[PDB]
Amino acid sequence: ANLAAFLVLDRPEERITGINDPRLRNPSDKFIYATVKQSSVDIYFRRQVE
Amino acid sequence: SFMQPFQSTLWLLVGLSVHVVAVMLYLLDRFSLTLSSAMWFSWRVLLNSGIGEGSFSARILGMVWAGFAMIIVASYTANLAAFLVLDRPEERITGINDPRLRNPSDKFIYATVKQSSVDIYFRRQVELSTMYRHMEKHNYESAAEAIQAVRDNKLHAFIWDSAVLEFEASQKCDLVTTGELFFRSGFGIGMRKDSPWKQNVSLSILKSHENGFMEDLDKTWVRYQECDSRSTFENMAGVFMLVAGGIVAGIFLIFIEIAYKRHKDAR
Amino acid sequence: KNEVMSIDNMAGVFYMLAAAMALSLITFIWEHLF
Amino acid sequence: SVWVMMFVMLLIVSAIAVFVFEYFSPSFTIGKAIWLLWGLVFTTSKIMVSVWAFFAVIFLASYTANLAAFMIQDQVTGLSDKKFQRPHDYSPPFRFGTVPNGSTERNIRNNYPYMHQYMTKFNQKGVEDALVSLKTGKLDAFIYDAAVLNYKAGRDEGCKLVTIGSGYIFATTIALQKGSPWKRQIDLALLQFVGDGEMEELETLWLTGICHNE
Amino acid sequence: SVWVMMFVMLLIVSAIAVFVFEYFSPSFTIGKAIWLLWGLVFTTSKIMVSVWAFFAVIFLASYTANLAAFM
């Protein structure tokens, strides 16, 4: 039972799904994200708000 | 749950493979016991009574049949865990965000009571306009009508009075509140504007909120009642049907067949 | 909705039956003519 | 009644084997028959009972799958616990604290004054006092502005601090000067904003962390 | 190369237990030794190989769980 269980079930991983995740929304120091300066990503961020 | 769900097609394939076992083992004899011996070696291993002992090559192929049997039993236990845990279990409406409200259908009919507050919170908001041409054409006049419409399997779901629904979920085993709240407001007292009974009444109300009388009514009328939560199966019942019928039918073949073999021994 | 089906019909046994018949052929030829 | 089904059907099959013995009679039933029954729970009719043995594999697999059913899929209940209400009747004595001269302190002074005589050994100064004192175990838990605690619930490192129960609210339920002309207009406004769902847009903006995505 | 591991380790431990009972000789090798191997894949040192038999249950359970992985 447990050998089927902990090869199928929970605690398998933790995978970032998008901007809607709290790992971007509530930022942390153990999650560091970056881009390249003077880029278009800089633009689409510095235009939007939230 | 069921019978054997495992493809009577495949069951015939398994039974004809049992014939493959028998036919092959009795054909591999005379290369160097010939009537029913290797029959019962075969049905001993494949069923799973013995794995025990009993020139080289037929025994090799019997061990191959043991490999077959263990693969086949592993497949059965695999799917028996699978379709008791996994998919196709249900389909449960989660909230207003579901397409069963958003893209309405004729096999999903939803209703309320006319001249109600739900009528108000719908006809004020916007993007549920497609709701009304369903939601206005099937309505009711009292709560027990909706209750028995759930009882009579007439209507699928309701958006209604949260306290009342948590009661009749906790009272009778037919009902479940699903989702979050909607249009979160309060229940209070109705008074005229020139009625001077605002302020002292409000004072008494905050006294009731702070002195536990709210919790007093929550005990004395709200929080008592529970139903069970699923904590001798149709698989069990079907297996006792099949096995009881088959073995009693075997009993009433044993007498006649072995008695005719007693006639053969008399010959 | 996790696009699988609701038993199983893998080839499987067919390869295993073919392996078993192949082993029967590999064994019963070696008759001791010497 | 499942174990009853087991005993009944094995009594039947034992009786069947006794029939088969007494018509072999032109090796112990009461002995060996029961032992060989249970032995493949875990010479012709021996076969007829061992038919059950193949179903016993299913009676294996069912109680695999049933346990594969059940092995795949708090402490304090509320203010009514005498954990709070009798702290020195339980060893060690408890540790609960509030922000000094808060509203809840007035409400429990209306409720339990002796409890306040215990609670005044437990004052704090700020939020991370509460946060670290739970993450270091310096106090047991807390009772406060509970929606605030719901905010700080979804924000924890690994989310191992959960407030009272599943949102059970105890001591339940905009400032205007008296005689202002401003009641009716602001009320009509706010009941529109409640009425038109933008409150839920606010909810999506500011409320949830991890915990409602349990 | 799981099947390779199986064939190799069974050849090794089989040859071991055979020469073990040949030192016992003051039952068949290529006969009974192989059959009693594979039989609990699916006289005191015999026990020592059936230790594997308990791990064989695990070698059952793994290919339950692995197929429970893929199914």
* Touching partners of B (3+ C-beta pairs < 8 Å): C, D, E
CB atoms under 10 Å from CB of E44, counted, come to 7
> Known binder of ligand: residue D136?
no
**C28 shares contact with chain B (CB less than 8 Å):** yes
Helical ranges in B103-233 per DSSP H: 117-124, 129-135, 143-151, 162-171, 199-210, 213-217
Q: For residues D142 and D95, what is the distance between their CA atoms, to the nearest angstrom? A: 9
Stated in angstroms to one decimal place, the resolution of this structure is 4.5
Q: For residues B29 and B59, what is the distance between their CA atoms, to the nearest angstrom? A: 11
**D21 shares contact with chain B (CB less than 8 Å):** no
CB atoms under 10 Å from CB of B247, counted, come to 19
Q: Tokens representing D6?
A: 């087991």
Interface contact flag, A7 E65, Cβ < 8 Å: yes
Strand duo D96-97 + D141-142: pairing: parallel
3-state secondary structure of D98: coil
**E62 shares contact with chain A (CB less than 8 Å):** yes
Which chain D residues are closer than 8 Å to B212 by Cβ?
A: 111
DSSP state string for A1-50 = -HHHHHHHSSSS-----STTSHHHHS--SSS-----TTSHHHHHHHH---
Q: For residues B193 and B198, what is the distance between their CA atoms, to the nearest angstrom? A: 9
Q: For residues D214 and D103, what is the distance between their CA atoms, to the nearest angstrom? A: 31
The minimum CA-CA distance between D23 and chain A, rounded to whole Å, is 44
Interface contact flag, B88 C23, Cβ < 8 Å: no
**Cα angle, residue D10 at apex, residues D7 and D15 outer, rounded to 5°:** 125
Q: For residues B266 and D187, what is the distance between their CA atoms, to the nearest angstrom? A: 106
The minimum CA-CA distance between E51 and chain B, rounded to whole Å, is 17
**D64 shares contact with chain A (CB less than 8 Å):** yes
User: How far is CA B187 from each of CA B117, B190, D92, rounded to the nearest angstrom?
Assistant: 12, 10, 43
3-state secondary structure of D142: strand
**C27 shares contact with chain B (CB less than 8 Å):** yes
> Known binder of ligand: residue D104?
yes
DSSP state string for B30-55 = TT--TTTHHHHHHHHHHHTS------
**E4 shares contact with chain B (CB less than 8 Å):** no
Q: For residues B175 and B85, what is the distance between their CA atoms, to the nearest angstrom? A: 23
Handedness of CA E38, D57, B69, B40 (dihedral sign): positive
Q: For residues B80 and D64, what is the distance between their CA atoms, to the nearest angstrom? A: 9
Identify the burial level of C20 via C-beta atoms within 10 angstroms of its C-beta, where 0-12 means exposed, 13-18 middle and 19 or more buried.
Answer: buried
Q: For residues B177 and B94, what is the distance between their CA atoms, to the nearest angstrom? A: 10
Q: For residues B219 and B169, what is the distance between their CA atoms, to the nearest angstrom? A: 17
Interface contact flag, D195 B125, Cβ < 8 Å: yes
Task: Give the contacts of B143 (CB within 8 A, at least 6 positions apart).
Answer: B113, B160, B161, B164
Handedness of CA D31, D32, D36, D42 (dihedral sign): positive
User: How far is CA E33 from each of CA A35, B64, B219, E60, rounded to the nearest angstrom?
Assistant: 66, 16, 73, 21
Interface contact flag, D64 A9, Cβ < 8 Å: no
